[PDB]
């Protein structure tokens with residue numbers, strides 16, 4: 001048993017708050033916000049040795065990242081930003097920081113009861129996305 005055991009699995013989005021405004025804050029245009037906002041992605045988290053893989057799949061877009069904790073990597077986000085990302089574990093929370101064009105946003109992933117809770121923060125705007133086991 002290891003670092004991210006309680007995250008591993010397939011998770012389905014069930015609820016969202018303030019995600020349109022989060023997207024606005026990160027620069028997403030109107031049409032992409034409206035289409036992406038409908039999506040109910042599946043987030044599939046797996047671990048192989050030190051490598052964590054997070055796949056996020058929806059009608060809108062499929063994304064896949066693999067990484068080692070603390071080790072920066074290139075990411076193309078679902079909204080097509082080209083960012084430098086680092087993911088760390090801080091007190092049992094996966095903390096995903098994305099840097100691009102002098103800007104920064106943080107996505108936190110946390111296990112809470114039987115849910116996986118995702119908080120996306122850009123400046124003063126926070127959005128919460130709640131996932132259940134698929």
Ligand SMILES: COc1cccc(-c2c(C(=O)O)ccc3ccc(OC)cc23)c1
Pocket residue numbers: 023026028032033036037039041056057058060061062063077078079
């Ligand atoms: C893979 O399908 C989707 C569907 C819906 C939203 C997202 C998504 C995630 C995510 O769920 O990993 C994280 C961050 C985002 C930031 C901006 C964004 O603008 C469209 C979309 C984001 C991905």
Ligand SMILES: COc1cccc(-c2c(C(=O)O)ccc3ccc(OC)cc23)c1
Pocket residue numbers: 084099100102103104
């Ligand atoms: C790419 O990754 C990072 C990591 C840490 C810091 C920054 C960063 C910040 C920031 O987020 O505080 C602000 C302004 C910057 C201006 C130039 C810059 O050189 C590429 C990096 C800047 C970027």
